[PDB]
Design a protein around this nucleic acid. Structure first.
Ligand SMILES: [K+]
Ligand SMILES: [K+]
Ligand SMILES: [K+]
Ligand SMILES: [K+]
Ligand SMILES: [K+]
Ligand SMILES: [K+]
Ligand SMILES: [K+]
Ligand SMILES: [K+]
Ligand SMILES: [K+]
Ligand SMILES: [K+]
Ligand SMILES: [K+]
Ligand SMILES: [K+]
Ligand SMILES: [Mg+2]
Ligand SMILES: [Mg+2]
Ligand SMILES: [Mg+2]
Ligand SMILES: [Mg+2]
Ligand SMILES: [Mg+2]
Ligand SMILES: [Mg+2]
Ligand SMILES: [Mg+2]
Ligand SMILES: [Mg+2]
Ligand SMILES: [Mg+2]
Ligand SMILES: [Mg+2]
Ligand SMILES: [Mg+2]
Lengths: 155, 126, 122, 50
RNA sequence: GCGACCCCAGGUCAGGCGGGACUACCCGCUGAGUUUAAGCAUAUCAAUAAGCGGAGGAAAAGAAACUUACAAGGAUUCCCCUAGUAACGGCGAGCGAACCGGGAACAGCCCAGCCUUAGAAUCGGGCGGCUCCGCCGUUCGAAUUGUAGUCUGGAGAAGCGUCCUCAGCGGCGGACCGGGCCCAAGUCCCCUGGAAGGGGGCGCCAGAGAGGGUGAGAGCCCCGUUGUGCCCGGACCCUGUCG
RNA sequence: ACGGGCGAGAGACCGAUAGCGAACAAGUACCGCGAGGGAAAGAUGAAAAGGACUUUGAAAAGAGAGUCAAAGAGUGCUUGA
RNA sequence: GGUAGUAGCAAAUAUUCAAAUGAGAACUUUGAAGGCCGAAGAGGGGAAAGGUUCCAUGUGAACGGCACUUGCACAUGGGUUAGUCGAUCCUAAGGGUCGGGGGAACCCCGACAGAUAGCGCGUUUCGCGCGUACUCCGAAAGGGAAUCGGGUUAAAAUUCCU
RNA sequence: AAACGACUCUCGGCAACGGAUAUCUCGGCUCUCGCAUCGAUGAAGAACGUAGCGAAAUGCGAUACUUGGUGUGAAUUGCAGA
């Protein structure tokens, strides 16, 4: 060691050359993920490609509590307030999270309004074509049904 | 430009495939063009060379020679013609190998399979 | 004079056995000729006779196996040599029905709340 | 030795059969690269090590 | 002496299961020293090499006895960042995570226990049938020292209302995959050459000028290449429609 | 995740002392009691047309002659420091 | 490459004469002579070890440290015959094991923690009586059922023939 | 009389020795992608055999360089025969 330099602390004393991960497959990984997404979209047609609806939640800790992001799933309290049975929500594209507690009225009300908007914007095909049930949509609505590619409810 | 992902442009792979081709593939690889009259009549461009086919050489020292094919030596990638031969130092006569791509077929030996192949080739050209 | 497989299939077991015996005797005679400086014409027949013997044996074996398979059809506990080979792991696998088995509550869940067909437009 | 096992004798028989020159017609084959029997053995040069 | 049960013994009894092989990844165990510290013992090398086992196409993990202290997130896994940071360390040499935040992907569930007692409603074997990966009938056996069913904390049981939801089959297609067949254009004139595939002239094809072969740098000699058309077979899964 | 298995596509990589040890009957020949160790070795010509025949020699071969565009390409055969 | 056609070819008493073959003979074969091994051999057989080296015919090159017509080299063929000779059977020092006891496991101890194998009599194949936990490996010199002459091949014989 | 010759050395042509150089390549190395399929129904490995003419490699199992089905459609080939 010589001269005025920062004290070196390179962590290269083990057999590090046997644990090097290169990224020569990055374009291949991107292509494979795009192919998987396209196959999934074809499979779930006409359901939206963005996936199931997610709640609006706050960021954790003082650094991000001013931020709003997407949570795992809607709380049981939110589903009850919105009138959506918890056993039915997953089947109609609504994620359910039985763990999330509701501590404030603002978040619960925001998620209830979000669920109401989703219900207003939702079209449900009947289980059997010739049979129409309570939750099914009219033929006019069903005819003009298409798959949505991007995020239908940006947060 | 090649676009099929299951075909290779590698020189090494193409050479290996050609030089390790089995007899059935070698037969197709050993194709020759048909004459102008035969091409007009059958609406076909080229055919695999057969034993009893009539052939006219169009390249090399035997550019004018013609005759009947007498052997298709697939292992050697050459055919043998009736009178296209040469004399050794001994004085005996040996046939000279000619590559099928360098000859022209003037008369085909026709059978059921040959006619079927000719019809199949003509159908695509329409 | 050549042996045709499709003609062998139309013969009975006794005739096939007699032909096999004749072919074996001819092969033995050809071997004797080979060991006694036989001519190339006789030597070339060894391959033909061996091929004929193999063809006759194959036809006999296939007929016997077909008969055994027919006899054991619609029956459980077949002979091991007549059972499907596949692979060991495949043979050990659970059947499709066993794979699809589930509890009553799971059946009720799939009957009551299956994944619905829906779109998001209006 | 005079006393030998059956298996050793059979192995020795195979070794004797393998100790011969190549057929002459092998050299005339199209695209032939074999010049001689590279695995020839002499009882005094290399021992079988059985 | 007979009978019931219990534990155990012998069966080439009827029908099944297991051992072993491979190494790139994966799971469990065991486990150094060379080396660095300018010596060396803690440390480092390394929770590594060697050694002993166990799987698959991935494995492992996985549905909070979690993260945090926020206006709160919400199974597991992986990537970026956190971060060479908090911490650890003859506080020397060195070592060194996690949460938040942004992304890839997303999926949730099954049991034990109180709750049939108007009868084990459960399951295995043999035998006989059937539209045979299973269903039905009959007969033996397992099981009450508990097989089915309900329940799993997100709940749930019971009671009362609401009248909201729930029951298959078969045909023809689409989607996916694996194959088969045909299909463009010069080998025209002159020269050098053993051989034009070289030079010069005149033409042509091109959604085909990727590549290879043939007697020397070949788009048009041959196989192919590009783009259509037709044909065959799997996967019984997804999807549209029809009776 | 994936230096094994089966099957594919590529490369500003190596070009026979290089590149895997191995472009070849290479994990072969060979060595070691054994555990193990482990090579060397690619190029005629377009086509064998692979040199008939004469002569000298015991023979290997030499001198002529012949094939080929070429033997100033004659089977350990492109070139040959 | 120089060294260099140099260092070396020297232990085991020794060769000689005539003829035959051959292109070629100090080195092959025949005969004669002169010597050696001298029965605890330079003779005649086996065990281990080797594996065709055994026998016949032929021979370009290489090899046989000079040479070769030659041969334990090369090439093509041939050759090893058992009721009696051996293995095979028995057990020795010991080895390998069940069960049991240890062990993460590869594995360790080894009849020591245990319902042994089975063996005899008569039979409607069932009954009766005995039954101390290995009926396994381990000797071509230990133990041990049985062959002798005579003859025979290029090469086998107590094996082939009588 | 140090001339001709021999020797040594040196320079050039030619001929030897050796296999460098150049031009090649059915091989190697590296990256990426697809799939998931060994075994008591006896695997991997190991041995012995098998062709008219083979020792090795490759293949195969006394049906032994292959039997049978199907596809393709006139060869295999070093020689001989069918
Ligand atoms: K500095
Ligand atoms: K039953
Ligand atoms: K239960
Ligand atoms: K090497
Ligand atoms: K040359
Ligand atoms: K001689
Ligand atoms: K134990
Ligand atoms: K014991
Ligand atoms: K003995
Ligand atoms: K006698
Ligand atoms: K000179
Ligand atoms: K076949
Ligand atoms: Mg798993
Ligand atoms: Mg920083
Ligand atoms: Mg995160
Ligand atoms: Mg039953
Ligand atoms: Mg040239
Ligand atoms: Mg073309
Ligand atoms: Mg004595
Ligand atoms: Mg001898
Ligand atoms: Mg035990
Ligand atoms: Mg005994
Ligand atoms: Mg080079």
């Amino acid at each position: 060691m010589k001269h005025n330099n920062v004290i070196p602390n390179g962590h290269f004393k083990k057999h590090w050359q046997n644990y090097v991960r290169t990224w020569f497959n990055q374009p291949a990984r991107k292509t494979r993920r795009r192919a998987a997404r396209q196959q999934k979209a074809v499979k779930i047609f006409p359901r939206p490609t963005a996936g199931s609806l997610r709640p609006i939640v706050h960021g954790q800790t003082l650094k991000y509590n001013m931020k709003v992001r997407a949570g795992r799933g809607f709380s049981l309290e939110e589903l009850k307030a919105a009138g959506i049975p918890k056993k039915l929500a997953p089947t109609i594209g609504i994620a359910v999270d039985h763990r999330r507690r509701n501590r404030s009225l603002e978040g619960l009300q925001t998620n209830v309004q979000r669920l109401k908007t989703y219900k207003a914007k939702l079209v449900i095909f009947p289980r059997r074509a010739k049979k129409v049930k309570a939750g099914d949509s009219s033929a006019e609505e069903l005819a003009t049904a298409t798959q949505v590619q991007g995020s239908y409810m940006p947060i | 430009m090649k676009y099929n992902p299951r075909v290779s442009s590698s020189r090494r792979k193409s050479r290996k495939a050609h030089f390790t081709a089995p007899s059935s593939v070698r037969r197709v690889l050993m194709s020759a063009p048909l004459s102008s009259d035969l091409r007009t009549k059958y609406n076909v461009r080229s055919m695999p060379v057969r034993k009893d086919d009539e052939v006219q050489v169009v390249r090399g020292t035997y550019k004018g020679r013609e005759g009947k094919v007498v052997q298709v030596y697939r292992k050697k990638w050459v055919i043998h013609i009736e009178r296209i031969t040469r004399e050794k130092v001994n004085g005996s006569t040996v046939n000279v190998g000619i590559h099928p791509s360098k000859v022209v077929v003037t008369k085909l030996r026709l059978d059921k399979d040959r006619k079927s192949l000719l019809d199949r080739k003509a159908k695509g050209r329409a | 004079a050549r042996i045709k497989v499709h003609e062998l299939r139309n013969k009975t077991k006794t005739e096939l056995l007699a032909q096999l015996k004749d072919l074996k005797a001819e092969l033995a005679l050809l071997r004797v000729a080979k060991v006694t400086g036989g001519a190339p014409n006789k030597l070339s027949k060894i391959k033909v006779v061996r091929l004929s013997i193999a063809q006759v044996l194959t036809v006999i074996s296939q007929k016997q196996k077909t008969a055994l398979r027919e006899a054991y059809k619609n029956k459980k506990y077949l002979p091991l040599d007549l059972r499907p080979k596949k692979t060991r792991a495949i043979r050990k696998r659970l059947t499709k029905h066993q794979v699809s088995l589930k509890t009553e509550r799971e059946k009720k869940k799939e009957m009551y709340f299956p994944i619905r067909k829906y779109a998001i437009k209006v | 030795p005079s006393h030998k096992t059956f298996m050793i004798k059979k192995k020795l028989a195979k070794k004797q059969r393998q100790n011969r020159p190549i057929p002459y017609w092998i050299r005339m084959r199209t695209d032939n690269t074999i010049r001689y029997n590279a695995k020839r053995r002499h009882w005094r040069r290399t021992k079988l090590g059985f």
